[PDB]
Each structure stands twice: as structure tokens, then as C-alpha cells.
Design an enzyme around this catalytic site. Structure first.
Site, PDB file in Angstrom:
ATOM      1  N   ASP A 135       6.089   2.208   6.806  1.00 35.60           N
ATOM      2  CA  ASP A 135       4.956   2.049   7.704  1.00 35.60           C
ATOM      3  C   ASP A 135       5.107   2.661   9.085  1.00 35.60           C
ATOM      4  O   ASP A 135       5.725   2.068   9.969  1.00 35.60           O
ATOM      5  CB  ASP A 135       4.684   0.553   7.832  1.00 35.60           C
ATOM      6  N   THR A 136       4.519   3.836   9.268  1.00 40.41           N
ATOM      7  CA  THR A 136       4.590   4.521  10.553  1.00 40.41           C
ATOM      8  C   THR A 136       3.810   3.784  11.638  1.00 40.41           C
ATOM      9  O   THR A 136       4.013   4.024  12.825  1.00 40.41           O
ATOM     10  CB  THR A 136       4.042   5.952  10.456  1.00 40.41           C
ATOM     11  N   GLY A 137       2.918   2.889  11.228  1.00 43.76           N
ATOM     12  CA  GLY A 137       2.128   2.142  12.192  1.00 43.76           C
ATOM     13  C   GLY A 137       2.825   0.916  12.755  1.00 43.76           C
ATOM     14  O   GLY A 137       2.354   0.319  13.723  1.00 43.76           O
TER      15      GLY A 137
HETATM   16  C1  1UN Z   1      -5.102  -2.369   9.219  1.00 44.17           C
HETATM   17  C2  1UN Z   1      -4.618  -2.618   7.785  1.00 44.17           C
HETATM   18  C3  1UN Z   1      -5.539  -2.352   6.706  1.00 44.17           C
HETATM   19  O1  1UN Z   1      -6.787  -1.895   7.036  1.00 44.17           O
HETATM   20  C4  1UN Z   1      -5.190  -2.542   5.301  1.00 44.17           C
HETATM   21  C5  1UN Z   1      -3.899  -3.006   4.933  1.00 44.17           C
HETATM   22  C6  1UN Z   1      -2.960  -3.285   5.967  1.00 44.17           C
HETATM   23  C7  1UN Z   1      -3.297  -3.097   7.397  1.00 44.17           C
HETATM   24  C8  1UN Z   1      -2.298  -3.363   8.370  1.00 44.17           C
HETATM   25  O2  1UN Z   1      -2.551  -4.017   9.408  1.00 44.17           O
HETATM   26  N1  1UN Z   1      -1.030  -2.783   8.076  1.00 44.17           N
HETATM   27  C9  1UN Z   1       0.033  -2.982   9.074  1.00 44.17           C
HETATM   28  C10 1UN Z   1       1.304  -3.280   8.269  1.00 44.17           C
HETATM   29  S1  1UN Z   1       1.411  -5.115   7.972  1.00 44.17           S
HETATM   30  C11 1UN Z   1       0.706  -5.244   6.373  1.00 44.17           C
HETATM   31  C12 1UN Z   1      -0.083  -6.394   6.151  1.00 44.17           C
HETATM   32  C13 1UN Z   1      -0.686  -6.546   4.856  1.00 44.17           C
HETATM   33  C14 1UN Z   1      -0.509  -5.572   3.803  1.00 44.17           C
HETATM   34  C15 1UN Z   1       0.299  -4.401   4.026  1.00 44.17           C
HETATM   35  C16 1UN Z   1       0.909  -4.248   5.339  1.00 44.17           C
HETATM   36  C17 1UN Z   1       0.022  -1.683   9.939  1.00 44.17           C
HETATM   37  O3  1UN Z   1       0.409  -0.563   9.168  1.00 44.17           O
HETATM   38  C18 1UN Z   1       0.985  -1.662  11.129  1.00 44.17           C
HETATM   39  N2  1UN Z   1       0.235  -2.229  12.280  1.00 44.17           N
HETATM   40  C19 1UN Z   1      -0.617  -1.064  12.779  1.00 44.17           C
HETATM   41  C20 1UN Z   1      -1.496  -1.560  14.054  1.00 44.17           C
HETATM   42  C21 1UN Z   1      -2.507  -2.645  13.490  1.00 44.17           C
HETATM   43  C22 1UN Z   1      -3.377  -2.939  14.822  1.00 44.17           C
HETATM   44  C23 1UN Z   1      -2.516  -3.544  16.015  1.00 44.17           C
HETATM   45  C24 1UN Z   1      -1.374  -2.611  16.538  1.00 44.17           C
HETATM   46  C25 1UN Z   1      -0.580  -2.116  15.241  1.00 44.17           C
HETATM   47  C26 1UN Z   1       0.302  -3.334  14.657  1.00 44.17           C
HETATM   48  C27 1UN Z   1       1.121  -2.800  13.390  1.00 44.17           C
HETATM   49  C28 1UN Z   1       1.844  -3.974  12.884  1.00 44.17           C
HETATM   50  O4  1UN Z   1       1.196  -4.789  12.118  1.00 44.17           O
HETATM   51  N3  1UN Z   1       3.162  -4.008  13.372  1.00 44.17           N
HETATM   52  C29 1UN Z   1       4.188  -5.079  13.052  1.00 44.17           C
HETATM   53  C30 1UN Z   1       5.510  -4.693  13.848  1.00 44.17           C
HETATM   54  C31 1UN Z   1       3.672  -6.541  13.444  1.00 44.17           C
HETATM   55  C32 1UN Z   1       4.440  -5.068  11.557  1.00 44.17           C
END
Ligand code: 1UN
EC number: 3.4.23.16
Lengths: 99, 99
Positions: free
Chosen positions: A25-27
Site C-alpha cells: 500500500d503506497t497510500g
Molecule cells: C479509500 C479506500 C477505498 O476506497 C477502498 C478500499 C480501501 C481504502 C483505504 O482506505 N485503503 C487504505 C489502506 S487500509 C485498508 C482498509 C480496508 C481494506 C483494504 C485496506 C489506504 O490505501 C491508505 N490510506 C490512504 C489515505 C486514506 C485517506 C486518509 C489519509 C490516507 C490514510 C492511509 C491509511 O489508511 N494509512 C494507515 C497508516 C492508517 C494504514
């Protein structure tokens, strides 16, 4: 390896001697794994994303082999919806985004 | 281009002819943009992040240029702290993870 994104970039990792599946996860700034036991002492911390914050256990200098590549760094353990390998470790294995 | 992960992979995106900074996020299945008053019909949707779910508005077939590369697809608008470009669009610009 080169990984496309038509499906979730899931990979197998080795941590604490156990195999697990995690998402590249690059995000994510940090690496967060589902609740589990890990050797050493941990510190209480909180991290947030979309949806809000969660409480996690911070373990430092933890070795993790990701798809055959070695990394040793901070691993957060808590009620994360899924195991995520964040930039702190992605940089250690020389992972980049390309297009 | 090649983007390393030492810092958040933020790039400029163009939506509605307007420019915004968004995170190239391999960990997101969808593209979620900070609240913006886009015209047209939308469908209610719930997306889950690290701290739970948030309600978003789903807009379909929206043109979006990511760092110079054109794409078109579904964009979700809601209370996210950061604009995120998910796999639904990353695949369209031929983005891969490499190590
Ligand atoms: C936005 C989104 C979708 O539309 C669909 C599926 C998942 C997500 C989602 O939020 N994925 C996240 C991984 S956490 C995750 C949670 C559930 C399933 C898979 C991954 C993002 O890639 C990363 N995510 C991107 C971004 C989300 C908005 C707030 C600032 C960052 C926070 C960061 C994040 O959560 N960082 C942590 C260090 C807390 C892990």
C-alpha cells in the site's frame, strides 16, 4: 517483480516465523497488521486514515521478509481491516510506482 | 515517470478542469476525493478505511487526468482528509509497483 493493479497487490510475508498475506500500500505511511503476538515490547499508539483513528501496538525494529525481500522496521499491530505494508517498509525493499 | 515512496506519492490531478493534489494509492480499490461540489446525479455509497466507514457520493464516468495521463471512471466524493487515487484509475494510466 512488476505488479499490475487489476487486482489487489497482495503478497506473502514472513514475520515472527509465520506466513501472512499483506497488501502493498503506497497510500499508507505505516505498516499495520491485524492483531497478533510479536516478540519484544510494544508502545501504545494511534493512527488514522479514512473513517478515523484506531489504537495500535507499536513494535520497533521487526524483521519482515516481503516477497523474498528483507526489511526490518516499525510494525503497528491493531484492529486494522486488513494487513498493509506501508511506505516505511516499501522503501526498504526498493519499491517504486511506475507509469 | 518513476515515483519513489520516501514521501507520500502526491501528484497533480485534473478534474472539472481544476487542479488538485492526490495520493497514488495502491491500497485503495476506489478513488475518493475530498468534498467538492460536482454537478450531476450520484449514488450513495459506504467505503471503509482504517478507522471505519464513511458515506460518499458516487459519480460515474468522470474524466480525470493524473499527472498528465488521461483516465475516466468512478469517483467518490466525501469527508476524506486526503484525495486518493485508487486502483480503478491507476490501472487506466498503466501504473505498476516495481521492486
Ligand atoms: C479509500 C479506500 C477505498 O476506497 C477502498 C478500499 C480501501 C481504502 C483505504 O482506505 N485503503 C487504505 C489502506 S487500509 C485498508 C482498509 C480496508 C481494506 C483494504 C485496506 C489506504 O490505501 C491508505 N490510506 C490512504 C489515505 C486514506 C485517506 C486518509 C489519509 C490516507 C490514510 C492511509 C491509511 O489508511 N494509512 C494507515 C497508516 C492508517 C494504514
Amino acid at each position: 517483480p512488476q505488479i499490475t493493479l487489476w487486482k489487489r497487490p497482495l503478497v506473502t510475508i514472513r514475520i515472527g516465523g509465520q506466513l501472512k498475506e499483506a497488501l502493498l500500500d503506497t497510500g499508507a505511511d505505516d505498516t499495520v497488521l491485524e492483531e497478533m503476538n510479536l516478540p519484544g515490547r510494544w508502545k501504545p499508539k494511534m493512527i488514522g486514515g479514512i473513517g478515523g483513528f484506531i489504537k495500535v501496538r507499536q513494535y520497533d525494529q521487526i524483521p519482515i521478509e516481503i516477497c523474498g525481500h528483507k526489511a526490518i522496521g516499525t510494525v503497528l499491530v491493531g484492529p486494522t481491516p486488513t494487513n498493509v505494508i506501508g511506505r516505511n517498509l516499501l522503501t526498504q525493499i526498493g519499491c517504486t510506482l511506475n507509469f
